[PDB]
Amino acid sequence: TPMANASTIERKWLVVDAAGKTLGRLSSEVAAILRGKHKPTYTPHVDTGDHVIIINAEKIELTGKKLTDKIYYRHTQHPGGLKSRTALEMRTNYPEKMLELAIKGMLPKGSLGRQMFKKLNVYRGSEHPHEAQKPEVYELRG
Amino acid sequence: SYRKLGRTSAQRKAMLRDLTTDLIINERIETTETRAKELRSVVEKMITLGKRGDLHARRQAAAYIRNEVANEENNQDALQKLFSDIATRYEERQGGYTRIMKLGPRRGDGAPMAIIELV
Amino acid sequence: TKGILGRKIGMTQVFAENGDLIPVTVIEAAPNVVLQKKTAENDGYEAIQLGFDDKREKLSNKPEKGHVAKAETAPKRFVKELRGVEMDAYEVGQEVKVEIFSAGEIVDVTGVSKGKGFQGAIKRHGQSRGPMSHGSRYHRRPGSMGPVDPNRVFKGKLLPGRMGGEQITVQNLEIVKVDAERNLLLIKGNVPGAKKSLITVKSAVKS
Amino acid sequence: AVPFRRTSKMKKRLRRTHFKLNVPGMTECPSCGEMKLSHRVCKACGSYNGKDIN
Amino acid sequence: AAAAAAA
RNA sequence: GGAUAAGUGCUGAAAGCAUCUAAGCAUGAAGCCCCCCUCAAGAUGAGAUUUCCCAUUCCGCAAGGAAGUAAGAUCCCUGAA
RNA sequence: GCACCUCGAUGUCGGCUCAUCGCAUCCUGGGGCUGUAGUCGGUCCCAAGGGUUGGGCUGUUCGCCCAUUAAAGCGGUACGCGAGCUGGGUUCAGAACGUCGUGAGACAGUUCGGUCCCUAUCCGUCGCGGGCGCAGGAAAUUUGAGAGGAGCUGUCCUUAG
RNA sequence: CUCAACGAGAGACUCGGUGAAAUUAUAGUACCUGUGAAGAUGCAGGUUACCCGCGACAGGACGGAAAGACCCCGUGGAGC
RNA sequence: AAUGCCGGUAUGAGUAGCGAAAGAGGGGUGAGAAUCCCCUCCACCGAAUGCCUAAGGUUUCCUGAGGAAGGCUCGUCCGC
């Protein structure tokens, strides 16, 4: 009886700037955008969410002493395979997969989660190659 | 590297001597393909031994040719046949005295058979 | 850096300037023709392509014939890249020869090692052998797969398999003699691979 | 060395995917046919490029 | 005892 | 080589002094991340460069489906580095 | 200690083979305090990267001794590992010694001898193939997200007696 | 054995012919850390993983084979 | 739903095995031949793997046809 969209979803493109916000508070909003929680036509099994582009990923910041205390782990399937780096080294070299690990942590787990991860595009600032899609600038709610 | 053909080395030597002599009398035999490939080099080596015609080459060939009758009502041995007919037939030709022509697989064991002939 | 690639023939021994006897590996490695120059603005990195041992037109494809048309040369059997050479210093179609190496230099030798087939753990991994007597039924076997508690075998457990056919680099070999007339490099020591296989000789990482 | 569970029908059929055997290298015999497998003497006419050698 | 001597 | 641990510090106030620290700069280990070697785009995020082959026929009005083929590869055969 | 799991079976010691992990670090690396003149030391920090032995005795772990070494480190993984291996000891059926019991017999007291099955279905690991994908079909050359390997040290001469 | 390296034959490998057995709740049957009848392929959180085979190893499936032989109970039995 | 009884059919799986130790070639029969017949070499036993004669089996012995099932494959052959 209620509406449930399928193959009629219109997906927009959004640009999110990460110059002054946390890792962090923006990542939950980006995950909610990718899920489609901002649209009234949300249906939980058809991925009504839309594309988002994040620029200035190197300008991200995070409060406290997390630059030296937050540790990322990438354990292999080999014994003694625990490899670790700090948040400063992960931000300094390539913070793109920092942001994608944040979004992947806040996205749901499943086939739709891997599908909604594909709409995310994180780039080192401040230009993106998606000008042909004509993305609009999105301002964060807070 | 030579093949082992599933035999003991003494059995290998005996079977190769038997096949060499039987090819030398009957001039066309039908064996398996790998037996043909192992046999052809030995047969052309023995034909090369027959090319020389001297006593020492004949005594070398006598250690390999088995004592079976070659030509009936003539009392010709195979060792006489190498030095009378095959050597005079292949005097001009330099190697390649045998050819191998493959047949279909055998019924009882799926063995690929081959025709061996002196050419 | 500099380098050249070719075929090794076999090993011999050469005494030089004293009574001392040197094991020597002989490599045919000339001439090599520059086929393609990789640039950072187009390919993303700097490298050159070297072609060796040209062949008949029957064994070469039309893309292979068209790829070597720019260098003005016959199609070649072996193509490999060198990275990173001193850019540019070589133009497309210039012949690289054995005169670039003097007979006192230190070079890196790499190649595909000899194949051994599917071999047991004793030969493949150097594992020690079980007793042949005192009632023992154990020898030539890889060992216990590990503990009980993980309920699994850990990754990296050394087991029988195929040995050889992989790329092996031997570091810091010395050129004994260079032959510009017969296109030969004489290298001190042992070189991986079988006879008439492809051997790449590059300058060592100094120092 | 004892099977813990029985193999289902679908796993057995998936294992029997590669159990099939291929069509032999059979070609037209130039003498009579039909047909003749490659690099062997024809069983019908007994010829091979192109003499009747049996 | 727990002797593994099954026949 | 780079950031470092324990240590050694420089300039300095909270607390007019003093102070290795709360801001800012160093130095510092066979630990770490590279430089040494090897596998690596099924990295479904499937990347990149060079060079060939070309844009047929018949149905399906659209999507698409069959036959022959080019570049190229395979069946079959001689063998082993 | 308790008796929660297993008595329509969870094979138990010590060795062999293969290892992996944690430092409460044996050596090697960097330091502080020393009643550290120098060498050698003592104690306490940071550090698991690598390496941490050949025998005689005993089934032995342990332990003692011989000879080295830079050191011969502690533990966990069903006191790691018997569908990977041996049965010397425990731990069957025979027979003795000492002791107890009238006796049949008994002894974490001793000694001699004594059947260790399995053709791997699935997950795991080590290698090798066939498909399909990578928005045309191909032949080559490749960047590297990631992953694995390696990582140990002695002695001598100068500086300089 | 230090310390193992080759060679010969049979099996194992490939092909042709013939062709079982133990076992088996169904099964599209990853890993780590926990939880739980206190030791998880199936539970929770995370980390990985294209589909289907062939040759090997045996860590797990508290694997299979024998209603544990040890210990205890039965107002069971048998031998001395 | 009794480690129930009986019957049928799967899994393992086209997998293990096909049971000491010499065969090779040329002719013949036949729809079909590595396995049956003939010939020529080669090989094995030879205080036996030779000759016969008990116990035992009982027709298994010979000839002519046959090949369904039984020959751990085949079979034109056999102690069928």
Curated annotation (Swiss-Prot), chain A:
Gene Ontology CC terms: cytosolic large ribosomal subunit; ribosome
Keywords: Ribonucleoprotein, Ribosomal protein
GO biological process terms, semicolon-separated: negative regulation of translation; translation
InterPro entries reported in the protein's UniProt record: Ribosomal_uL13 (IPR005822), Ribosomal_uL13_bac-type (IPR005823), Ribosomal_uL13_CS (IPR023563), Ribosomal_uL13_sf (IPR036899)
Keyword match Ribonucleoprotein: yes
GO molecular function, one term: mRNA binding
Record-linked Pfam families: Ribosomal_L13
Keyword Protease set for record: no
Subunit comment: Part of the 50S ribosomal subunit. Binds to Obg (AC P20964).
Function statement: This protein is one of the early assembly proteins of the 50S ribosomal subunit, although it is not seen to bind rRNA by itself. It is important during the early stages of 50S assembly.
UniProt name for this protein: Large ribosomal subunit protein uL13
The species this protein was found in: Bacillus subtilis (strain 168)
Curated annotation (Swiss-Prot), chain B:
GO annotation terms (biological process): translation
TM region(s), chain numbering: none
Disulphide-bridged cysteine pairs: none
InterPro entries per record: Ribosomal_bL17 (IPR000456), Ribosomal_bL17_CS (IPR047859), Ribosomal_bL17_sf (IPR036373)
Any Pfam family: Ribosomal_L17
Matching PROSITE patterns: RIBOSOMAL_L17
GO cellular component: cytosolic large ribosomal subunit
UniProt superkingdom: Bacteria
A GO term for molecular function: structural constituent of ribosome
Keyword terms, alphabetized: Ribonucleoprotein, Ribosomal protein
Assembly information from the UniProt record: Part of the 50S ribosomal subunit. Contacts protein L32.
Family, similarity comment: Belongs to the bacterial ribosomal protein bL17 family.
NCBIfam families: L17
The protein's name: Large ribosomal subunit protein bL17
Organism: Bacillus subtilis (strain 168)
Gene this protein is translated from: rplQ
UniProtKB/Swiss-Prot annotation, chain C:
Positions of region (Disordered): 121-151
Superkingdom of the source species: Bacteria
Keyword RNA-binding listed: yes
Gene Ontology CC terms, in alphabetical order: cytosolic large ribosomal subunit
Any single biological process term in GO: translation
Keywords associated with the record: Ribonucleoprotein, Ribosomal protein, RNA-binding, rRNA processing, rRNA-binding
Xref: Pfam families: Ribosomal_L3
Gene Ontology MF terms in the entry: rRNA binding; structural constituent of ribosome
Keyword set includes Lipid biosynthesis: no
Functional note: One of the primary rRNA binding proteins, it binds directly near the 3'-end of the 23S rRNA, where it nucleates assembly of the 50S subunit. Strongly stimulates 23S rRNA precursor processing by mini-ribonuclease 3 (MrnC); 20-30% DMSO can replace L3, suggesting the protein may alter rRNA conformation.
Subunit and partners: Part of the 50S ribosomal subunit. Forms a cluster with proteins L14 and L19. Interacts with RNA helicase CshA.
Family to which the UniProt record says this protein belongs: Belongs to the universal ribosomal protein uL3 family.
Protein name, entry field: Large ribosomal subunit protein uL3
From Swiss-Prot, chain D:
GO biological process, one term: translation
Coiled coil start-end: none
Entries under InterPro entries matching the protein: Ribosomal_bL32, Ribosomal_bL32_bact, Ribosomal_zn-bd
Superkingdom of this protein's organism: Bacteria
Pfam families listed in its UniProt record: Ribosomal_L32p
Keywords: Ribonucleoprotein, Ribosomal protein
The keyword Nuclease is annotated on this UniProt entry: no
GO MF entries: structural constituent of ribosome
Gene Ontology cellular-component annotations: large ribosomal subunit
Signal peptide (from-to): none
NCBIfam families, per the entry: rpmF_bact
Family designation: Belongs to the bacterial ribosomal protein bL32 family.
Subunit-structure text: Part of the 50S ribosomal subunit.
Family matches, as PANTHER family: 50S RIBOSOMAL PROTEIN L32, LARGE RIBOSOMAL SUBUNIT PROTEIN BL32
Name assigned to this protein: Large ribosomal subunit protein bL32
Gene: rpmF
